Amino acid sequence: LCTYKVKPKLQRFKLYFLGTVTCP
């Protein structure tokens, strides 16, 4: 995706904690 760019919890990818090497 990498297109929302609001508070990240809508997809959690910007938290990185689980290996989510993606942007919201």
CA separation for the pair 15, 22 (Å, rounded): 10
Cα-based distances in Å from 11 to 17, 18, 22:
13, 13, 10
Measured over the CA atoms of residue 20, residue 21, residue 22 and residue 24, the dihedral's sign is: positive
Q: ∠20-5-16 over CA atoms, to 5°?
A: 20
Quick one: tokens of 1?
């995706």
Helix (H) or strand (E) holding 12: none
Burial 2-17 (b: 16+ CB within 10 A, else e): eeeeeeeeebebbeee
Helices and strands (H and E) in the chain: how many: 0, 0
